[PDB]
Design a protein around this motif. Sequence first.
Motif, short mmCIF file in Angstrom:
data_model
loop_
_atom_site.label_atom_id
_atom_site.label_comp_id
_atom_site.label_asym_id
_atom_site.label_seq_id
_atom_site.Cartn_x
_atom_site.Cartn_y
_atom_site.Cartn_z
N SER A 36 0.87 -1.23 0.00
CA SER A 36 0.00 0.00 0.00
C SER A 36 0.89 1.25 0.00
N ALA A 37 2.02 1.21 0.71
CA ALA A 37 2.91 2.37 0.76
C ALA A 37 3.80 2.50 -0.47
N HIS A 38 4.10 1.44 -1.17
CA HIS A 38 4.99 1.46 -2.34
C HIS A 38 4.29 0.62 -3.45
N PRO A 39 3.30 1.29 -4.05
CA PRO A 39 2.48 0.69 -5.10
C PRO A 39 3.33 0.04 -6.17
N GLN A 40 4.43 0.70 -6.50
CA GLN A 40 5.38 0.23 -7.49
C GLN A 40 5.87 -1.17 -7.18
N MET A 41 5.87 -1.60 -5.92
CA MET A 41 6.36 -2.97 -5.59
C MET A 41 5.46 -4.10 -6.06
N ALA A 42 4.19 -3.85 -6.31
CA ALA A 42 3.30 -4.95 -6.74
C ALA A 42 3.85 -5.68 -7.94
N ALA A 43 4.31 -4.94 -8.92
CA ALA A 43 4.87 -5.48 -10.18
C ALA A 43 6.11 -6.34 -9.94
N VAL A 44 6.89 -6.01 -8.92
CA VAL A 44 8.10 -6.79 -8.62
C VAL A 44 7.70 -8.20 -8.17
N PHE A 45 6.75 -8.24 -7.27
CA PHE A 45 6.22 -9.51 -6.72
C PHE A 45 5.34 -10.25 -7.74
N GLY A 94 9.84 -13.41 -8.90
CA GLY A 94 9.37 -12.04 -9.23
C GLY A 94 9.29 -11.77 -10.71
N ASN A 95 8.83 -10.61 -11.07
CA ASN A 95 8.66 -10.18 -12.48
C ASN A 95 9.61 -9.02 -12.77
N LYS A 96 10.20 -8.43 -11.78
CA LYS A 96 11.16 -7.32 -11.97
C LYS A 96 12.44 -7.70 -11.21
N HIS A 97 13.56 -7.15 -11.63
CA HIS A 97 14.84 -7.46 -10.95
C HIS A 97 14.68 -7.22 -9.46
N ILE A 98 15.03 -8.17 -8.61
CA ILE A 98 14.89 -7.92 -7.15
C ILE A 98 16.15 -7.18 -6.68
N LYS A 99 16.02 -5.97 -6.20
CA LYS A 99 17.22 -5.22 -5.78
C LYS A 99 17.37 -5.11 -4.28
#
Length: 147
Positions: A36-45, A94-99
């Motif tokens: 909820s605080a970092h919407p951008q993270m949904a795509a990573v997961f 994940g779907n995006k590079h995990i950093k």
Amino acid sequence: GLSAAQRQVIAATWKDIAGADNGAGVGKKCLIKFLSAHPQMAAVFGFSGASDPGVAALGAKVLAQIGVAVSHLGDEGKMVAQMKAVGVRHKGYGNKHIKAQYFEPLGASLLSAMEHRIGGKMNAAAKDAWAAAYADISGALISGLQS
Ligand code: HEM
């Protein structure tokens, strides 16, 4: 590595954090609030958003894994090797590079979720010890992830 005083605190509060669901509720809260605080993270997961049921499933798995690392605070060597192995597995997740950068904010969400469950037991000494425990646990995973 954790000093003996830190180890004592983590081990004691872990029993209350695990409660009666092996920490699943803490894991759900931690991830939901993180997304909820970092919407951008949904795509990573690979989640649709904070309310995707995979959030709860994954939160339970993460907390169960923390329980395993805590059981080995007596042998830092085992804890680290185990966490490194988990980290190597993340190379295919994940779907995006995990950093590495993503781990810091996750740690904040985790400590907040722990506090929400145990309240007053999360005193100054517990907050200090869990921040050090999370740094060692996440640090080991990242080392495997980046290997
Ligand atoms: C922002 C950091 C994180 C990201 C983006 C990440 C993401 C993922 C993803 C996408 C899954 C896989 C779901 C399915 O299998 O495809 C997963 C599985 C898993 N994660 Fe992570 N995770 C993070 C941090 C961590 C932390 C800190 C821990 C433990 C301390 C960890 C422990 C696990 C475990 C136990 C599972 C289940 C699968 C297996 O054991 O390999 N994760 N993670």
